[PDB]
Amino acid sequence: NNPLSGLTHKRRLSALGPGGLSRERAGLEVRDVHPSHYGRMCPIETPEGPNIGLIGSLSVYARVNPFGFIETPYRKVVDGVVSDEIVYLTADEEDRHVVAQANSPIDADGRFVEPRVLVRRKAGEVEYVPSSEVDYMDVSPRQMVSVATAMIPFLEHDDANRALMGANMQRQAVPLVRSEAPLVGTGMELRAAIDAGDVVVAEESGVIEEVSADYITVMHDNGTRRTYRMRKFARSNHGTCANQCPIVDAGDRVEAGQVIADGPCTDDGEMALGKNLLVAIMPWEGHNYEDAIILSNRLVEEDVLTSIHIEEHEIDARDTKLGAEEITRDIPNISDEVLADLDERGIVRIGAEVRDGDILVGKVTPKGETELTPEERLLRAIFGEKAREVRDTSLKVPHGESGKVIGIRVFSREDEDELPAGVNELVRVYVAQKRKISDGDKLAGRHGNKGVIGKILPVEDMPFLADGTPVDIILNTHGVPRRMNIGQILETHLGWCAHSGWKVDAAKGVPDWAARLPDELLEAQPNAIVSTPVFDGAQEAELQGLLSCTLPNRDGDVLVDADGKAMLFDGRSGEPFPYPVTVGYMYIMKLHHLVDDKIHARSTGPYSMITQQPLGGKAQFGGQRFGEMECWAMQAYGAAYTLQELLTIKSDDTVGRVKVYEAIVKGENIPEPGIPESFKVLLKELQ
């Protein structure tokens, strides 16, 4: 789906499969967190479905020894003295010592400030212990979390329930057309994007000889040239668009190991899983009811949440019993208008936009004469069309698919390409669609705050600030203090400080809230990028002070208050909102749960040959399953006729479904239900 998803999938630790355990033989003790998983397996990143606890993610600094156990690094503390010597310990090796927490107050020489420090001990015991007892200590505060888990800013303010969902939904992000790096970061974005392997890093130092949208040539210092080719508009495993774009220009000195080009979900070498959106926290006319999300139409007009999606369609021409399937433009009883987008071979042409039902590959299959319906033979007689022994089996666009044809690949046995025995031709057509954000598309943040798009108002209906700039997204207030994910709030504050910038009062010394802050943080320009590492980073005392010294706009007045709120105007009436509202910038991701894929409907269609019931899934054009529990609802209502209708004529009944269609197209009444075919099958099986 995105580079982070691939990195995480490569760092998986699965307890399932041969040699491990069966899912039915797994109690609640194999799945829960073990105290030896510290710094080795993440206690956060794990699916919440039936594979919870059975699949973990390797910790960041963790590694594997040639025996098979997972080692984690620690700084060796001799006698209360922090040393730069680092040693990797296994699980049982860690228990033979006691290790101090990473966030320990340490002297510049290395001595612990407090005699008693928080120390972990065998059997998962946390307690205060003397400074002369600490043998080792953690490398980084984020030593326990995974790569995706370490990408959640202000993670220490989110409960594990929603943090798990944030980490798992970051993997579900969709690569947008253009990507923006988040204002509020953690530092992990860069290394995540680089180690994921979807960017283009320079192997050797040199200068850029020739840069194009197709390739980048690097002239090394010794004299050799290395050319990196860009992967442009390639279909991923899940239909997402993997598109790389050059970053450097002509004649740029680039060092070794530097990102010269970045691919999907990447901006200047950092994970760009979403966009920075102006968010206001307030209920708005009920359109944001319990996590429903209102969006500004700007995001539609400016392709902010627009993504490219590529689908692969495929069809083959084989050898049949009465001849051979041939791919041809000549299709029986089809106008020259439907075949207008086809070339002389019967293949859709490159660049032609195709809706659902359009022909992509025209294939005809010879059908025997002894296979004809009596009505069909009469109809062939009353139209005088002889020599139509072939029937239409062309490749058509499925329901819900629409886009531009971007590529065609043809393999022919005659062309010397090797096909499976019995095939004479094979055609793959790639169709690309440009999906804007729509009503119902599932958005989410990094703190497990998911929601579908409930309404996309016009840009003038949006609650706009004092200088007319309308907000981009309206998040409901009610769905905030329940989930215990205050990070999205804190981010929203820091985000705004990143959008405007700040200037700390240098006169009369450095204030008492910014004494711990680095000197680089005292001054910030608009649209500045910041890092909040997990279990470290910004404290509330510093964020509260940053809110007080926010940079003014171009007109010179400050929009938000020191409380982090600003006065909004109701764009529908004009009256200002009676109270200030928390307004900031939040990083919102477009998850791969779009209504363009999740919508489905069926009048009639294919039925499973054995049970004579409609197919399943959207891909097979099937219907919804009125399960066992739903019939109980029908019976509790007392709606007998509705239930009988669902069970026979609408589904199973062999002749009831046809006469129902006839009764509808004739205007007649619905006929009487018959006997289900599945019951006949049950009797014939009991026999």
């Binding site: 700084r75 992990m188 060092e255 190991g257 530097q258 680095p518 910041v530 980073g537």
Partner: peptide, 23 residues
Amino acid sequence: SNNSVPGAPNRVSFAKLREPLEV
């Protein structure tokens, strides 16, 4: 600064704890 090794954009870290070992 944060991650001043490959030549990446300068993201400013709110970090009080130094990094003894890189990822």
